[PDB]
């Protein structure tokens, strides 16, 4: 069987998101690093087992793929599509490589980020660097429990990993990233009941609102999609809070994994463009996307054999 | 008098916040100071016993005169710039220090958010650092950091104001300096050459014997004896910080002492040197870009405003 | 087919809830059954991954006919009362079982609260027990409890319905009995006499050799071999409970098996005895005050 | 003098046992009191260092007179019933309190078993509650509970008898009340209306500012200043308990203080009200079904008995 | 279908290695014990689950196999082959039975070793007993991280467990044991850079030296072997530090598991006999093997069906 | 004002006991190490803070004291007194220096023992080295809970630390060490009830037997001593299990700390020589002492000022 990267890691309490572009002539340096990134993950992580829980997921963008590799492309790989809604906009920003680094502690993430960027100095330009921290009770920046309905076990594998539909790339996945900044002052002006109507779940107990009370423009209602087969379309989301109190920056870094980008893209269309029953996702009245990129995260064996 | 949590254990995460008080900000600051222990309990209590959240609040010399009438702490003055032959210890603005520590960065951030929320419109941020200790108690240079800090009774005697300034008993003095490292130059040294810079073995943290420890090693220069033959001691809670994209690899220094004269004597030896040492060799790999001195009063002084 | 969490890791806290469905409560019950996996995730997620919260939902024989049309699980029937020469296994009412386990009682209680909140006006509570682990995985008799439970593939084979009843594959059968102990009489036995009752060493939990193990020891009577010479196995997740003021020192027994015939053969040996054993000596110190049988369907059955 | 473990580290489980001493049970009770520290060590030592087992033993006013022939603690009297215009604080029988705490209920239960085993035939049980920590130190109303308890030196000064009653130095006074909550009525309030009852924010546990905090909020009525302008403080170790089938959702209140006058002044404000407040709004959702006062002597007083 | 023993154990911090010979006439006692060893593992281990992580792996030597069992032998079972190199020697020492006992705590290991040796008294003679302990961040006595490049998951199963090539013994494995004593005085006279050239990795950070700088006689270069298909040949090594400061004994207990002994034997030949480019493994200039034995560790159900 | 060594350490799960003799001419090397032992303890221990709990207590024997130091001697310092009972003997064996090393993990103990013995090579000869481990719920090799009745807090300080009776040595303590080997075959031939009569406590529950059933020759009855003024004479005992399954060696390493050796020596006299009511301690019918040494453990500041 093809070995996937650690896409299906549990939630961790810390993360570093690194997005870079590949400079002209940086291709060979990048390929050498990609062939070593699993050995660097083991080097930093092994000595901190079993509590460290260090992993790195490496993704490659559409344009970068054509510069790095000859032969077949993954079927679903394309640049992130800008969404220009009546009120809210999902921007497309540059990114050739994603490093999604997770651990129980920020220092382990930083040590791996240092070894990776050390090997890439002179070959890449940093576009985004976010140090994420989950709150102690699994809450996000908005004060809600975050990750509850993520798939687990066999359902997660089926939702997230490329299989027989694209056999040369089996065990890969597609990652969409968006960095969101929140209007915390406007959010904290809402009553708890009004915040629950925005999300679609109870704030303290994390119980879903019943179908009779859940607004059609609630985050949970708009991101609930059924496929051709009547089954739920599922993604794995590993949202991380980040920020700077001095700059009044209060963010959620969104990363969503899926077997095809079509699922994530359908959810984004419903959020930003709306439906017959909803102008847009009410979460967007308190959240502005300032980045947007799509990456293919190949099977671990594809990176090793390069 | 109850001291603030100056004598906290080691924590793996910290936020350092330094702000200046804007024109007319005094009343807003006084209200927050009277509430900061209650905000620390509000954020921290629900995460006990693993959170280990604490906040130490410090006030600078100029800010003291704007906020309070009556007696000043005897040792409170602005940070003294040291302009050495090679290396310089700079002075930068700061009226208020918040030294926030916990087992996890999210608890530090949640307390920092409530504090800055109450101070919006009254202060200007000067510095914000999110610190993380390495899982083996190492700093950015790869050395174990904090080994010779005093503990128990020796720590109380070294750090807390007593009968020499009785109105301020239970207070302390904090010196902060943000350092940026030349990691490329440091990593070009052999481990043996790095051990000669610090004065300790890198892997095992055993002190070099007096016959091998260079006179210009960090441990040799920061070892000071008082007139009475006693070691002069401070409590240092150094925290790594950085940004890989910006190639920023730092150590945030904070040193607590019963009088600033001890910390200032250590800085003079590091920056100006001795008869036997031009300067602290750690400064050939470390540049100070901030410098501020604060008085951290007893907790009941802040509560009684 | 996805089973419920019948094969849960060891947990230190449990709530057992047994209710009857009132006349006209059927639709309220069906709506809750379709939601119970969502409620388990809602309560459990905020304590992940150390919470280990799970709920196993079971349905009784009589309740099954009131709730559903079409096929019944092949083994589902009311608990059979056993009237032995000395000891009796009583049958008591129960339409729904909630077997709630976690590493802490708060998670169990919060899930029990949401479930009973949805069922208010539709059900009558029959039994509620709050169980706790007692130091060294010990029970109220001071013996290690759970040692010989099957694990891995052997556990799946022993506990889950397969191809013998294909519409119900991934289901299981749960037998529950609440036991109260005579701790005064038990503590009057020497340790060596207690070891002869159970069939294992008290401190070290080593099985007694075949030459010394009495025929009427608990371990000898509950050891049954099937047609092929293989041991017939169940998964037992016994939990201590009690009230010191009322002198109630209990074991809540729950036994999971792929067919109730295995568990029922063990109960017959214990209560009725054999040619070699009058009855299980554990029953001279333990009185059953409840007895019910439930089918715990595959998770996908409850969702649709 | 060595105090009992009144100032215990944080624990997640408790058993509260209240018994009366039967006629002729005095000798059996005295023998047990002289042994209760040895029983605590016997059950607890084998589970060190994580068990954190302690037992605090309290004696009521009437029981004190039956057991001991010398001086009484200055503040010991039967619990004073408070008959308010709306709410009543009942006085119920209790001679002995066992306040048993640990990191796990098994240790509490095993110690309760050994104590009651020694007292069979000499006492009648009045009350038995098994308490548990609920999430992030919340009580059954969904609020964080314990936040403003004193710590360290301030706790010692607030809770332990000193030079004002020198024969009893190291002792304390415990008031117990078992409360049952009307959860249906409580859950009909908005979160903002709940916060006005308590005096703190529900999710974040931030105290309401003095300009918004109602005069009849729990935090406003239990905030008392003494003759010198200093705050009068108690140590409260509230524990949730209940039974979902019987719809019993409770708070077991125990308050420790150096003199019962502090706790009694707080109860008078709650139940009888002030010029500005009819009564504590928490009592519109909470009914006291027990009320007892106990003196918890220094450990060496119990050890030195016949 | 065949259940392997716990060859692929999670990470554990304590171990006992017991090697015994079977005395003349001890065969029947040994067969009875082998049929009971999984029941003894459950008896000691269950009460400490789930954090105890107690397991025992039982191995049988080539000569003992012929004394105990009639019928088929595992295809790869033979006595350990002595290697007489120009400088360094890998000695063969007697051993009929291996007990590889691991747990999170030494007490569980010791209690299981006690029950096993209790059943075997008068049937076996102990040859070697070592109590191993985890040393800081997974370091060995040379101060290097040890275990980094072990296979995990499916790759570990494929490398370690017998499959269809020897179908009667599927789910078995081969264990090679060597007890090594280190010359710590000579090792600590090397600079860290000279130590890194011996191992082939950075000491503090555990990053592999690049192919241009890694010496051909480094430990990592000599133990890196490719098979006929260009794939790396892998083993599972679970090295444990041990020692006695008073006797200046600073040791590594090596145990290597593989699906066939030919892989481990090829690594030993390269270390002891060298290649065209390396006289021998430089680690052997600081490490002396004082035992050497090979065992077959059968599937669990082979032992149970005695 | 004098700082004691960590005689009153929290509970630890691992220990190394090192006893050495000082070779002719080794005095100066020993004095240098004594002045550095607190610095070595911090160097090894800091990197594992705060859960490591590493401490070293250094003791000096009577003969060694006279070789190392001039002037006043601790008032109670003498060689261990051999006890020649009618049946049982307490042997005196050589030992000049004791290192009593404790931590939550063996690796910290071992690393500190290595640094100490490294500094002492050529100046000392090892006499005894034992690696101790916690055995289940604080049990010893006889299956009984061990340490239950040790004093704690202020009572422990008063029992263990030299004060005004020997003011030049205030803050010191006296340690008696005896290595015991158990006859486990003889012990396992007793019923549990017969074992309980040997110890004087219940085996599973660790409840003391009542005064009406506790035999006069039980361990608990013989080690219970009152002084002329009615107060209990107390020691701090920190017994550690050790052993080797292959050698059938099952031991208890006894170390007892007291403010004067007269207390410990009175307990040993009652055990070995007996009383009017008891021939000897019945624990000695299953336990043989194979070492016996007495050391003075000075105040930390005494060692630092060399
Ligand atoms: C500001 C950014 C976001 C925040 C703070 C956020 C937060 C949340 C929260 C609190 C929940 C409820 C608990 C849970 O199931 O995890 C949720 C559910 C979910 N979110 Fe988001 N979200 C964000 C952006 C997105 C985006 C961009 C997507 C899709 C492209 C997305 C997809 C989902 C999905 C699919 C669910 C699960 C719905 C269900 O089946 O119940 N989220 N989110
Ligand atoms: C610039 C970055 C700095 C770094 C990375 C650093 C790092 C270290 C390290 C690794 C040690 C040895 C372990 C220990 O005892 O903690 C140490 C010791 C010490 N440092 Fe620093 N340090 C820095 C700045 C300073 C400053 C600014 C002062 C005083 C003003 C200072 C005072 C000391 C003292 C007093 C010791 C203990 C010396 C002794 O053994 O007595 N350090 N430092
Ligand atoms: C008062 C109620 C009960 C108590 C206190 C109790 C206690 C125990 C104990 C201490 C063991 C030995 C350790 C272990 O393997 O778990 C055991 C084993 C066992 N019990 Fe029970 N038990 C009770 C009721 C039952 C019931 C009602 C059944 C079956 C219907 C049952 C079936 C078994 C089985 C099958 C074993 C494993 C036998 C073997 O293969 O070794 N038990 N029980
Ligand atoms: C149903 C019964 C009760 C409940 C649910 C309850 C709950 C709470 C809560 C949520 C708080 C705020 C957080 C904190 O500081 O602990 C609080 C504070 C407090 N409660 Fe209660 N309480 C109850 C009864 C009592 C009683 C009977 C007394 C005293 C006789 C009392 C005295 C206090 C005090 C002194 C405070 C702290 C006020 C301050 O200084 O901020 N409580 N309680
Ligand atoms: C003195 C005894 C030994 C010591 C101290 C030792 C230490 C190490 C160290 C530090 C590494 C690097 C980290 C790692 O991947 O584990 C390593 C790797 C390895 N060792 Fe050893 N080892 C010893 C004996 C052996 C023996 C006898 C064999 C084989 C028969 C062996 C096979 C290996 C293998 C296959 C690797 C992984 C190489 C790679 O692909 O990266 N070692 N060992």
Author numbering:
A (entry chain B), E (entry chain C), F (entry chain A): 7 to 312
B (entry chain E): 8 to 312
C (entry chain D): 8 to 311
D (entry chain F): 8 to 313
Reproduce, without paraphrasing, sentences from the article in which this PDB structure was first reported:
To assess whether disruption of the Asp–Arg–Asn triad in DtpB leads to a wet distal heme pocket, microcrystals of each variant in the Fe(III)–heme state were produced and subjected to RT-SFX crystallography using a high viscosity extruder sample delivery system at the SACLA XFEL beamline BL2 EH3. For all variants, well-defined electron density peaks were present in the distal heme pocket, consistent with the presence of resident H2O molecules. In the N245A variant, only one resident H2O is found, and in the R243A variant, four resident H2O molecules are observed, with three of these accommodated within the distal pocket and the fourth positioned in the space vacated by the Arg243 side chain. This arrangement enables w1 to be directly linked through a H-bonding network to bulk H2O (wb in Figure 1). In the D152A, D152A/N245A, and R243 variants, w1 is positioned close enough to the heme–Fe(III) to be a bonding interaction (average Fe(III)–OH2 distances within the DtpB hexamer assembly of 2.52, 2.83, and 2.28 Å, respectively). Site-directed mutagenesis has revealed that distal Arg243, and not Asp152, facilitates proton movement on H2O2 binding to Fe(III)–heme, promoting the heterolysis of the O–O bond. We have previously reported that the distal heme pocket Arg243 and not Asp152 modulates the kinetics of Compound I formation upon mixing H2O2 with DtpB.
